[model samples]
Target: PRVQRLNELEAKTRVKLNFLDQIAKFWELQGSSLKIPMVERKALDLYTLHRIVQEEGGMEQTTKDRKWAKVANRMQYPSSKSVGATLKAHYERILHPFEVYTSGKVL
Candidate 1:
């Protein structure tokens, strides 16, 4: 069942990579808002949240407090899977600058 297993593994790995990408993007925007200005943070926060999946990753602050007035937003930290582990898994390949592992055509 190599094919079956491979398919499953790839599917999970693909999802994991996606999660990692969003996390990175979120941080990028978060930092921009903090270090730079505005647009900025809100733009980054949302952009990253949608992509980051904070709650999905577990970066909620009020996780302890019940949701209420503020209702705040999203951005969970310390996902079940850390960056190191995720990166290690993602780097499990060697396609080079001319690879076709990710997507799109080789063209």
Candidate 2:
């Protein structure tokens, strides 16, 4: 189950990687830092995935999808599940700190 979730995330992350590379290449041509907030967020997401796979016992695709949907629904909607709220809040809480520490370095 965890493997399936990780595979799905890995696929999504590959798309993010392409986007990051293109953006970074643009900055490279201009001799500037990438400095894209979305890029930083994507990096954080990937790092989170890594940690989840390494630490948490991994999860199935259904579990992952449900959690993500609940998180999205809860942020702008009313009355979310406790687990969903916790998951969303946890990720959001760490994102800023991770970005501050990593400074958009995706490697």
The window of 10 residues in a row where model 2 has the poorest summed lDDT is 35-44
* Candidate 1 regions with alpha-carbon error over 4 angstroms: 1-12, 29-62, 65-107
The residue-by-residue lDDT of candidate 1 on 1-107, one tens digit each, is: 52211122122245444544544454564442111101212222233332332334322332233231122222332333343233222222212322343347521
User: Model 2 off-target regions past 4 Å?
Assistant: 1-80
Candidate 1: clashing pairs of residues: 54-76, 58-76, 58-77, 59-76, 59-77, 60-76
TM-score of 2: 0.26
> Residues 1-107, candidate 2, lDDT per residue (tens digit)?
42212122223456655654554454465554332222212322433343443244323342455554333342343434654444544444444444554466744
After best superposition, candidate 1 residue 44: deviation in angstroms? 24
Q: In candidate 1, how many Å is residue 6 off?
A: 26
TM-score of each: 0.17, 0.26
